[PDB]
Amino acid sequence: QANLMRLKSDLFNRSPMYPGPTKDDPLTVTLGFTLQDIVKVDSSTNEVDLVYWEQQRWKLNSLMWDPNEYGNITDFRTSAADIWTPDITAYESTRPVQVLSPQIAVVTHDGSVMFIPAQRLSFMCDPTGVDSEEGVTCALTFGSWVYSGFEIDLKTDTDQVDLSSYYASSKYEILSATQTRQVQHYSCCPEPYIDVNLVVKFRERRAGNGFF
Amino acid sequence: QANLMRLKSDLFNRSPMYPGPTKDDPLTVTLGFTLQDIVKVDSSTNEVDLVYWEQQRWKLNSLMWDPNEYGNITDFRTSAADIWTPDITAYESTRPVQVLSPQIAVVTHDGSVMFIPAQRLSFMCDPTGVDSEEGVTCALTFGSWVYSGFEIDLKTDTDQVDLSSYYASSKYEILSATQTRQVQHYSCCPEPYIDVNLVVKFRERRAGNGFF
Ligand SMILES: NCCc1c[nH]c2ccc(O)cc12
Ligand SMILES: NCCc1c[nH]c2ccc(O)cc12
């Protein structure tokens, strides 16, 4: 309605977009994973396919407004394309990510943003032994592709992956799933890079729905 | 044992073998099945492979002896080739039976015989639906190939198939298995023939070893 139109116009039509973080003005991105399904393993290529929701949060001064000036609006939904978003990337993917949901963020009056896209990703993982009781463990790291820890820091709110929406009749059951902040280096550059390490231990489900 | 050698010589060396039953001298064969494994199903040919032990009992007057005359021997094992055996045949087999055990019978002084060969058999059975909770039912009839009920009658001691030796980690679990005496007629002949109807209801096993 009228007040929201005013707010979007004011935030988006009169100043250049935020040019991303810098050493002088770094940004911390909070990451969290909701693992929905391990869809497929490929033992001939050592690729495993996950469906997850990637919760991203961050805060920009440039996205702040006074609710009093905008009919007491305290937050709004807007296309992710309307705002700056962090280049958080899976470091061991083997196919382009497939986006399974709209890409729309919620912006709150204090400048904070919540963005949770659903994604399917193939990544590097040797699934040998998945059909046993002990299962198998794979790891996948997520971090900025181009910014070091001098510009983008990462944080999780919990080290436990959210499994409350995990598909109960998946071919695979989850034995454990953790998300932990780490600090990695790459050959291109000397600077400290930050990642979140997603560690999933899983095995073929042989109990529950479809099992009698 | 000298006494046993005498007995076998006296029984097997000095008279023509039993020419089989007749209308004037009919015979009753007791049958019982021990189902050990449902090994394989073939949904492209509608054949299923069973492993079972087939317990057969009958009694011949010509196999009697007085234990007093033979050092109190009341029974002995001997090769099934030494004695007459009934032509009990599976009527819906699709391959020759494969024998998995020695063929040796126990003969008792009253002329009674017990013979329990282990067998693998492929038979006519549509396995469609075996991977469901309801499973599938197949039936297999066993009886004399050439003797009518006027020469060979059949009997079971129980209508329950013995499942006490069924392979706990089979691909298939048994939902029920019965063995029931019936009467049948074939195009070739007007006389009633007797059979035992083996009816097995089963499904893919999804709870037990290999499952967690
Ligand atoms: N649809 C589940 C996640 C979800 C709930 N509310 C949202 C708002 C924005 C967003 O990107 C994601 C979400
Ligand atoms: N081996 C288990 C069946 C069995 C026990 N005793 C036997 C004697 C004879 C025979 O044919 C079979 C048996």
* Minimal C-alpha gap between A137 and chain B (Å): 17
Residue B111 Cα to chain centre, angstroms: 19
Method: X-ray
DSSP 3-state of A33: strand
- Where helices occur in B51-127 by DSSP H, the ranges are none
DSSP state of B161: P
Whole-angstrom distance, CA of residue B82 vs CA of residue B63: 11
CA distance A150 to A33: 24
Q: Which two tokens stand for residue A177?
A: 């799933």
Mutate to test the pocket of ligand 2, among B116, B119, B162 (most ligand atoms within 8 A of CB): B116
Residue A157 C-beta-side C-alpha neighbours within 13 Å: 12
Q: What are phi and psi of A70, to 5 degrees?
A: -135, 50
> What's the CA-to-centroid distance between A142 and ligand 1, angstroms?
20
Q: What is the resolution of this structure in A?
A: 2.0
CA A106–ligand 1 middle distance (angstroms): 8
Measured in whole angstroms, the distance separating CA A3 from the mean position of its chain's CA atoms is 31
- Name the 3-class secondary structure at B75: strand
- Residue B49 CA to ligand 2 centre (angstroms): 22
Nearest to A136 by CA among A48, A13, A64, A23: A48
Among B207, B210, B212, the residue with its CB nearest the CB of A212 is B207
Is the minimum CB–CB distance between B95 and chain A shorter than 8 Å? no
In angstroms, what is the C-alpha Rg of chain B? 20
Looking at A13-136, list the stretches that DSSP marks H as alpha helix, in order from N- to C-terminal side. Answer: none
Strand, coil or helix: what is B148?
Answer: coil
All residues of chain B having their beta carbon less than 8 Å from the beta carbon of residue A203 are 212
Q: How far is CA B52 from CA A94, A140, B34, B107, B171, in A?
A: 51, 51, 5, 22, 16
- In sequence order, the 6+-apart residues with CB closer than 8 A to the CB of A5 are none
Q: Hey, what are A51's tokens?
A: 């469906």
Q: Could you tell me if B113 and B63 are in contact, meaning their C-beta atoms sit under 8 angstroms apart?
A: yes
Of A207, A210, A212, the CB nearest to B212: A207
Residues from chain B contacting residue A207 (CB–CB below 8 Å): 207, 211-212
The alpha-helical segments, DSSP class H, found in B18-135 are none
Number of H helices, E strands in chain A: 1, 12
Domain residue ranges of chain B, discontinuous segments joined by +: 1-212
CATH number given to A1-212: 2.70.170.10
A24 vs B: CB within 8 A? no
The 8 Å CB, 24+ separation contacts for B129-133 are B130/B41, B130/B172, B130/B202, B130/B203, B130/B204, B131/B203, B131/B204, B132/B203, B133/A212, B133/B203
Nearest CA to ligand 2 atom 2: B116
